[PDB]
């Protein structure tokens, strides 16, 4: 079945589609690779003044912002628009997003982004198409609510928004507005695609200078900056973990993530994901990576590079050593409080087995066993 | 896979089987239609004095009573028979069921109904064959505990009750009762099928005129009568929603429902199911319906009629306008607190996006946008 | 301290206050009685066309409707007004209440009732002043949002609404409306008290003929009618239980109730509340009642009568036998899924102990023990 | 108020009451000591062939069996009996209890014990009178269902069973058995008290040689034998912890315990209970103990001895060193997964603070700090 | 009892105690004021290079950082030190804290802070002494683990650390280090108090440039910056809410908070806390505030100023209008997802009541009612 996969390899996005203000690059979600993990990925790049048209997909997704700064508007139906002009324009809460930020967008929730900044806004998007939250099918989809976009995953048969599917007249009556308006929602005459170029400066109710509960839930946490590292050692690297104990939404979404940075040839201690698949995106730098399966065979043994995406199947063993430039990456893990069990370090599996059992298992000195055990610093992020 | 379905259409039951006292009509659970939603449906009609023989299925089911009234007997193993004659006959709690009632029967739970009333008792039954509570397979089944019924779904190969599967002698010993009686549990000589005709009036411990906890959980709620609507507008229609916040069992069953009534050509605001599939049953009246998918294509654009059953896949857009007689329907939704996100009304998605983003997306007047937003009454159930 | 109470006695309300359209009767919440259980009670009577001005208390309360028919309007802040006129008047969901209905009103939630019916609408109100939901103090309070009511519990020092506490001018500015009306609202010149007489017929958006989730939670269940009994025996009586397995709100409120009806001298089997206090209201009929404490002393041994209110402290033993007219009552229990352990019946404590342990403890025949065990019908509700 | 207690001291029980077969010793629950922790304790001793009459208390209790063996019969109302002569005598599940066993008895649950063994059955019982499960008052109580026992806590005013509280005639009618048998139950003529001597051998449905769920929940776990230690070091001692992760009932009971054994002058590393009070019972051996409060003052600095009971208030610091005979004890902790934070060892607080912060706080060598951190073996249970 | 409080007033801290590097100011926790809400507050000010000695209290607390920057070290027992030097110094996770940050410190958890910055680090601390997490008594306490501090709350009788309570010799043995170093911990010769001045620069394993789960839980969220507002309107103010939907730890702690900023005389719409007490700390600016109780009496009607602390009891009505300089404040709310019900605005209670009920209650025009309802902008934060 699914994961008895034979060969693994890290790659860049297999596609690309241009839009008036930027492009979207996608990774084929068909490869024995992705499928096995039940994940789908794309890399959005929004040019300055770019507005990613509002959309929503049958799959929940975690969004790691690679670089840029910018605004994200999420829509939660049945909630009050809390941002409004005074004494007009009123809309739901606006969220400032930036490099290192991880954003969570539940399935069926519509959102729109906008590159308010000065540089290209870039972010990879990870969809959990096998999430219990998707009842459609193994295929990821993006239902647009505006414009006439080009299919991103859903490749022509495998366009238009959902409004365009209705009987223009009826819609208009529903909305209670002349057919012209609606001729317009449907955007059959819109030739721009997903991301748009805006008339000068985009402007709304920004705030520099009830449902205090549900409607105002947190959708993001920044795990990019060093100050927020959970694991760390000066000449090795730093690891930041993100889960239910960190961001509430992850609990209802059974999803966690990680963002690490390994220094001049450091080592991400040999470990094996316990309860989850680990889809990785090399943010910057080299890293020799070996992934082994049940039969000790290295299902993957190459040097992953910046811009590539690779996968560490659940329970498989994974070793990693940074290049000279170090290793920066983002990991999307397919389970709630996802965790790893390391087998080389201060919290290694080996250090948990009694002495003689170590020996008797490897046919080694009572001494050598000790060496295997206590010949190290901190498990996870070991220095050369 | 499953839901990349191409054409959709609303239909009446594809089968039917006669019984001494009434009949059962089923909808083929094979259609790319049903399958995708993981649902199955049948429509039971019990003639006065009719007793639906006790049974149970691998799938949980919600039962909406179309018309009639009568008694439903559920059996919860390990519970005490709390209804008994005094100072004999004693059985487990009896439930009066009636038009508009929605009944929840967990998988593996045996139940029997009886038309105590004066008119034909009619109800459609919705089975969630893809519920995590079913570990058999995509196929729905009904295990009978009495009589010699005809297969309802399970079509001859794709009869008898489970008792009839045992070694009569052994069974008898187990029950501790002569072979002749036991032979009879197995009803090989019973030629009546599922619903029976009773000897005159059926009598038990009825009540006109411990486990106070578990054994006495609520199995039904009536969402038919107007007084219990949750959403409502005089010249549009009234919507009643049913979920965990309403009936406890739905929590453990990840299932919710809806029963609506739209008046003289009213409009069920264009919306999209967020976290669930919506299987609909036209209780009475016309309604033009349009369902669209990821590619703006109207996977279904027809006028649904009374007696028909149609499906609105998760995340698909759905508009609906009542006929002259209005529209009465029952919806079975494949998730716990299932909800919708409307895109035309007082709680529409549009009213959530800031002004300029509306314009920039549809290339429209700062005014027109406002029109799109505030040119309406209550979202959900809009008037002509 | 608290429950080492000595003498118990059932009584009628100790007060009363008249209103333009009806009165409210209260039971002193100071008696060593109430206090011990952490409960408070009042009995509202609304004359036809009576409107109980909107209010809210620091304590959650369960409301059992003794007789009448009418409308209850609850307000959940942050929710959308889903009941509105079409194509004006718009308000939050309206709920019909009627005899036998039990209504749950969380602490801090404002509500208003109205006697739409033809007869006096009567209901007793049970407040759990020791609920973890009240952080004020052992004293129950009612914050009014309209009119100039008389203190119901809070006896002058131990009037006006909360609006009347603000600086009229400021209030007006906040509301953005001329001082002349903020005065009003305030209501210093209103001489009617809590329940009002309405101008002819009160009309709103009634419905004969989103937040489908939270905002539309169930607030009531009718445990009065016989058809909904959970325990029942023809010549004894019928018991209906109400808890988390029946009504979701009770879970978040750790509160359950019970409504019984015992026929011509029947017996509510000798039992002891396990995890809760049981405050009882005699809806109609006689009943000899005996309550015993840790020292086998009958802390209460009298014949409770209609209109009275009496208390059965947690763990105490309580026997009960109906009069000739029977016994109808409403019980308010201070815990979630509250239950009882009976010591005389088909589910008695005695029937759980082995034979010899029964004998050796009561110094009785191996036979007599059997008699104690199996000389009965259904535990709970025994016949003479 | 409550815990600003000044002086502490470990003591033996304070009372005692004889009864036919065995005796019960109690510790005054009034001392500023107990009260503060909301606990109460007694030490039951049952002579061979002794049967502790069935009873139940408003407080949940954990029972550590000091030594012996025997049978414990708990009664769960509404449950089927399932122990029982085959095709008579039938009763609810019987539990074999033995030295080192910890038994959990929820409040309001009736139980009876019987010394089946050859030696005196001894156990201390810890009641959590401040448990949210007791709504009576700070006073612990024991409602007897048989015999004419003497008050154990509830000292005459501060006897008989609850049956003895009813109108003999009425009771009899309820039970449906002649007045003669009834007056039995009430036992006014029973002069034996709590624990009884049985007619030769006691004998039921023992088993040497549905509700598979609730009715069969686990009520005990043995944390006495060494093989089940959770923390351990050869020349120090062994600690066994008991909580939600070990026994399900503790979850619903917010209660955990501990059973330790310290060898020839070993040290229970200086620690402070984080989320709970720790009531200790010296099973055997000496141990110098010091307990300190917020002001560094040793609220208790003595040598606790076998049979004594002492208390470690929440958050207070506690050091302990075994005598020459070692130290065996049982700890009752007032919270769910109760835990401790040690400040001297391999998991000490100190080892968690960075070096310089250690120095700067104690004004010590960068070296000395290291000494404080890494000059040890395993935290908890340190060797001399 | 507790909250039948008569007079309310906002004040500055009632005490102060100097330390080598900064001071701590406390508010008397005895005032009928605080007690009623079960809260305690102090204001710590740490001079540059100041190290607040590690401590822990029986009460959980939320810490709002008023200004400054700095490092907070929390210690979770049984967790691995994940921050360590490579290929020595190793300590548990260090957290960078800053102005606007809200930090959560569970009861019984030790922590230490350090002013790494250039300006005085200042923060108010709110203790929930009535939290179910405190089993000692209504009195807040701070158990120090280093130095010889002065009592902060616990006023001499109503000093030293817990180490100082042990028998120096024994402690030493436990720690396994010469008596000289031990006495050193106890710090009887330390004359500095809580906050210390450090030797030049303090410096550990900082990171600029397993238990990925529990041990790495989030303890802070910044609700100070404008970008993170949940409610907002340009000429009124901005409100930011913080609860379980934002920070995980608040769930296990039943605590939420708020940080608002009202512009040139804006209005915090008249509302009433539904399920919580609201303790407020004026960060900067004026604000007229009126708090009314059950009897419409304004238990508090003054102009609160910067540095003051005032209290809004649960269910009481509260209006607020900013000065000319605006109003900045931090609110500590005594419940989990704490929420308010407003009575003037777009989400007001009034807008939920039908028209005629509004009229009939205030004796006003069908029109005036409409005015009361729809004569506004966004509920919460209204503009002049």
Claim to verify: residue B182 and residue B102 sit in the same structural domain: yes
Chain A residue nearest residue B293, CA to CA: A162
Q: Do D143 and C317 touch (CB under 8 A)?
A: yes
- Percentages helix, strand, coil for chain D (3-state, rounded to 5) are 15, 35, 50
Claim to verify: residue C98 and residue C183 sit in the same structural domain: yes
List, in sequence order, every residue forming a beta bridge with B172; answer none if it has no partner.
none
Q: Can you tell me the distance from the alpha carbon of A129 to that of A151, in angstroms, rounded to the nearest whole number?
A: 17
Q: Can you tell me the distance from the alpha carbon of A384 to that of B19, in angstroms, rounded to the nearest whole number?
A: 80
| Integer CA distances (angstroms), E35 to C136, D4, D234, in order | 10, 17, 50
Helix, strand, or coil (residue D251): coil
Q: Can you tell me the distance from the alpha carbon of B240 to that of B229, in angstroms, rounded to the nearest whole number?
A: 4
Enumerate the residues of chain D whose CB falls inside 8 A of the CB of residue B174. Answer: none
Interface of C with D in 357-376 (CB under 8 A): 357, 360-364, 368, 371-372, 375-376
Tokens at A35, concatenated: 């499928």
In chain C, the number of structural domains is: 2
Q: What are phi and psi of C373, to 5 degrees?
A: -70, -70
Length of chain C: 384
How many angstroms away from the CA of D374 is the closest CA of chain C? 46
Q: Which residues of C38-60 are buried (b: 16+ CB within 10 A; e: fewer)?
A: bbbbbbbbbbbbbbbbbbbbbbb
Enumerate the residues of chain C whose CB falls inside 8 A of the CB of residue E321. Answer: 170, 173-174
Are E236 and C174 in contact by the 8 Å Cβ rule? The answer is no
First to last CA, chain D: 39
Claim to verify: residue B62 and residue B111 sit in the same structural domain: yes
Identity of the residue in C91, C137, C199 whose CB atom sits nearest the CB atom of E3: C137
Helix, strand, or coil (residue C205): coil
Tokens at C172, concatenated: 């007006």
Q: Say if C210 is an interface residue toward chain B (CB within 8 Å).
A: yes
Identity of the residue in B298, B339, B371 whose CB atom sits nearest the CB atom of A77: B339
Q: Which of B176, B207, B223 is the last residue of a domain?
A: B223
Quick one: how far is CA E372 from the chain centroid?
A: 36
Claim to verify: residue E136 and residue E156 sit in the same structural domain: yes
Claim to verify: residue D191 and residue D235 sit in the same structural domain: no
Interface of B with D in 66-85 (CB under 8 A): 77-78, 80
Method: X-ray
Examine chains C and A and say if they touch (3+ CB pairs below 8 A): yes
Q: What are phi and psi of E4, to 5 degrees?
A: -75, 30
Please name the residues in contact with D101: beta carbons below 8 A apart, sequence gap of 6 or more.
D63, D64, D65, D220, D221, D222, D224
How many angstroms away from the CA of A168 is the closest CA of chain C? 20
Identity of the residue in A212, A226, A347 whose CB atom sits nearest the CB atom of E241: A212
Q: Do C174 and E384 touch (CB under 8 A)?
A: no
Are E70 and E39 in contact by the 8 Å Cβ rule? The answer is no
Claim to verify: residue A69 and residue A167 sit in the same structural domain: yes
What 8-state DSSP symbol labels residue E351? G
First to last CA, chain C: 39
Claim to verify: residue B216 and residue B104 sit in the same structural domain: yes
Q: Can you tell me the distance from the alpha carbon of E327 to that of C360, in angstroms, rounded to the nearest whole number?
A: 76
Q: Say if E274 is an interface residue toward chain A (CB within 8 Å).
A: no
Enumerate the residues of chain A whose CB falls inside 8 A of the CB of residue B312. Answer: none
Q: Say if B215 is an interface residue toward chain D (CB within 8 Å).
A: yes
How many angstroms away from the CA of C34 is the closest CA of chain E? 16
Claim to verify: residue E231 and residue E309 sit in the same structural domain: yes
Identity of the residue in D136, D174, D203 whose CB atom sits nearest the CB atom of C356: D203
Claim to verify: residue C370 and residue C260 sit in the same structural domain: yes
What 8-state DSSP symbol labels residue A368? H
Residue C101: closest CA among C132, C122, C86: C122
How, if at all, do strands B61-67 and B101-105 pair?
antiparallel
Tokens at A77, concatenated: 């139906």
Tokens at B89, concatenated: 């006959």
Q: Which residues of C244-269 are buried (b: 16+ CB within 10 A; e: fewer)?
A: bbbbbbbbebbbbbbbbbbbbbbbbb
Query: Alpha helix locations (H) across chain C?
Result: 32-37, 168-175, 179-182, 355-362, 366-374
The set of chains that have 3 or more CB pairs under 8 A with D is B, C, E
Domain harbouring C142, CATH code:
2.60.120.10
Q: Is C112 exposed, middle or buried (0-12, 13-18, 19+ CB in 10 A)?
A: buried
Claim to verify: residue D145 and residue D196 sit in the same structural domain: yes
Claim to verify: residue B141 and residue B47 sit in the same structural domain: yes
Identity of the residue in C36, C293, C356 whose CB atom sits nearest the CB atom of D202: C356
Q: Can you tell me the distance from the alpha carbon of D315 to that of D22, in angstroms, rounded to the nearest whole number?
A: 38
Q: Say if E230 is an interface residue toward chain A (CB within 8 Å).
A: yes
The set of chains that have 3 or more CB pairs under 8 A with E is A, C, D
Q: Do D78 and B80 touch (CB under 8 A)?
A: yes
Q: Can you tell me the distance from the alpha carbon of A142 to that of A59, in angstroms, rounded to the nearest whole number?
A: 9
Claim to verify: residue E45 and residue E58 sit in the same structural domain: yes
Query: Three-state secondary structure along D98-165?
Result: ECCEEEEECCCCEEEEECCCCCCEEEEEEEECCCCCCCCCCCCCCEECCCCCCCCCCCCCCCCCCHHH
Are D291 and D8 in contact by the 8 Å Cβ rule? The answer is yes
List, in sequence order, every residue forming a beta bridge with A328; answer none if it has no partner.
A261, A284
How many angstroms away from the CA of C138 is the closest CA of chain D? 14
Q: Do B231 and C380 touch (CB under 8 A)?
A: no
Q: Which of E223, E250, E274 is the last residue of a domain?
A: E223
Identity of the residue in B270, B295, B360 whose CB atom sits nearest the CB atom of A171: B270
Q: Which of C223, C247, C278 is the last residue of a domain?
A: C223
Which run of H or E residues covers position D182? Answer: helix D179-186
Could you identify the residue written with the tokens 């009607």? E301
Enumerate the residues of chain C whose CB falls inside 8 A of the CB of residue B383. Answer: 86-87
Structure's resolution in angstroms: 3.2
How, if at all, do strands E69-75 and E110-114 pair?
antiparallel
Question: If you write DSSP's letter for every residue of A27-90 in order, what string do you get?
Answer: --S-SHHHHHHT-EEEEEEE-TTEEEEEEE-SS-EEEEEEE-EEEEEEE-TT----EE-----E
Could you identify the residue written with the tokens 């034996």? D192
Which run of H or E residues covers position D360? Answer: helix D355-362
Are A93 and A218 in contact by the 8 Å Cβ rule? The answer is no
- If one counts every other C-beta atom within 10 angstroms of the C-beta of residue C1, the result is 10
Q: Say if B86 is an interface residue toward chain D (CB within 8 Å).
A: no
Examine chains D and A and say if they touch (3+ CB pairs below 8 A): no
Q: Do E170 and D339 touch (CB under 8 A)?
A: no
Instruction: State which residues form the domain around E97.
Output: 1-223
Please name the residues in contact with B156: beta carbons below 8 A apart, sequence gap of 6 or more.
none
Which run of H or E residues covers position D24? Answer: strand D22-26
List the Cα angle D128/D130/D133 in 5-degree steps: 80
Q: Can you tell me the distance from the alpha carbon of D213 to that of D211, in angstroms, rounded to the nearest whole number?
A: 5
């Amino acid at each position: 079945n699914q994961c008895q996969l034979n060969q693994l390899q890290a790659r860049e996005p297999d596609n690309r589609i241009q839009a008036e203000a930027g492009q979207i690059e996608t990774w084929n979600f068909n490869q024995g690779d992705f499928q096995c993990a039940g994940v789908a990925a794309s890399r959005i790049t929004i040019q300055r003044n770019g507005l990613h048209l509002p959309s929503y997909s049958n799959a929940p997704q975690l969004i790691y912002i690679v670089q840029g700064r910018g605004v994200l508007g999420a829509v939660f139906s049945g909630c009050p628009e809390t941002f409004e002009e005074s004494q007009l324009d009123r809309h739901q809460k606006t969220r400032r997003i930036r490099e290192g930020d991880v954003v969570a967008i539940p399935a069926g929730v519509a959102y729109w982004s906008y590159n308010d900044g000065d540089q290209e806004l870039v972010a990879v998007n990870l969809f959990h198409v096998s999430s219990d939250h998707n009842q459609l099918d193994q295929n990821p989809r993006k239902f647009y609510l505006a414009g006439n976009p080009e299919n991103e995953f859903n490749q022509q048969g495998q366009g238009n928004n959902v409004f365009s599917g209705f009987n223009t007249q009826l819609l208009a009556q529903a909305l209670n507005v002349n057919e012209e308006t609606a001729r317009n929602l449907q955007g059959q005459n819109d030739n721009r695609n997903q991301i748009i170029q805006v008339r000068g400066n985009l402007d709304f109710v920004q705030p520099p200078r009830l449902e205090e509960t549900f409607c105002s839930l947190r959708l993001k946490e920044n795990i990019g900056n060093p100050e927020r590292a959970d694991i760390f050692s000066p000449r090795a690297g730093r690891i930041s973990t993100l889960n239910s104990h960190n961001l509430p939404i992850l609990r209802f979404l059974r999803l966690s993530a990680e963002r690490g940075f390994f220094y001049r040839n450091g080592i991400y201690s040999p470990h094996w994901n316990v309860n989850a698949h680990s889809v990785v995106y090399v943010i910057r730098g080299n890293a020799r990576v070996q992934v082994v399966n049940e039969n000790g065979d290295a299902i993957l043994d190459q040097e992953v590079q910046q811009g590539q995406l690779f996968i560490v199947p659940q329970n498989h063993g994974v070793i990693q050593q940074a290049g000279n430039q170090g290793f920066e990456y983002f990991a999307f893990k397919t389970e709630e409080n996802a965790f790893i069990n390391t087998l080389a370090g201060r919290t290694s599996f080996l250090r948990a087995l009694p002495d003689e059992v170590l020996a008797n298992a490897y046919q080694i000195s009572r001494e050598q066993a000790r060496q295997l055990k206590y010949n190290r610093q901190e498990t996870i992020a070991l220095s050369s």
